[PDB]
Amino acid sequence: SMEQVAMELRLTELTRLLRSVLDQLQDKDPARIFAQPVSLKEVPDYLDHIKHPMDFATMRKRLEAQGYKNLHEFEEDFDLIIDNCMKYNARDTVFYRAAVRLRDQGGVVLRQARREVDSIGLE
Numbered sequence: 195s196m197e198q199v200a201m202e203l204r205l206t207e208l209t210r211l212l213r214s215v216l217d218q219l220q221d222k223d224p225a226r227i228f229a230q231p232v233s234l235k236e237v238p239d240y241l242d243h244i245k246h247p248m249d250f251a252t253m254r255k256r257l258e259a260q261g262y263k264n265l266h267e268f269e270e271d272f273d274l275i276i277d278n279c280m281k282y283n284a285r286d287t288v289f290y291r292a293a294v295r296l297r298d299q300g301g302v303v304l305r306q307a308r309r310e311v312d313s314i315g316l317e
């Protein structure tokens with residue numbers, strides 16, 4: 195149907211916008227601390243601590259499968275990256291502080307993205 199095609203076009207343009215957001219968020223992590231899943235070989239007890247691991251590569255895989263239906267779903271995953279890190283790592287670590295900085299800088303990007311999704315009407 196034309197309606198299904200129209201909805202698929204909406205999802206595709208949402209995906210385009212979220213790809214830009216993801217690229218902007220990742221630019222705020224030049225250390226690439228959050229680029230890949232935390233290695234279960236290098237951190238064997240990680241899953242005892244963190245029940246839902248997340249990272250930018252995993253997000254990007256979901257993104258390209260058009261697996262984010264709305265911005266809230268995308269934001270949930272971004273929050274997991276930050277929140278997991280601030281639980282597993284202590285306050286005085288380069289890891290924790292990198293999450294804080296990514297959170298603070300990412301908030302600007304997500305604030306305008308919310309307005310754009312609402313304005314253009316993508317969900």
Ligand SMILES: Cn1c(=O)n(C)c2cc(N)ccc21
Nearest residue numbers: 227228232236237279282289
């Ligand atoms: C974000 N993040 C963590 O929380 N841990 C424990 C990590 C370990 C490595 N090796 C790389 C990134 C990491």
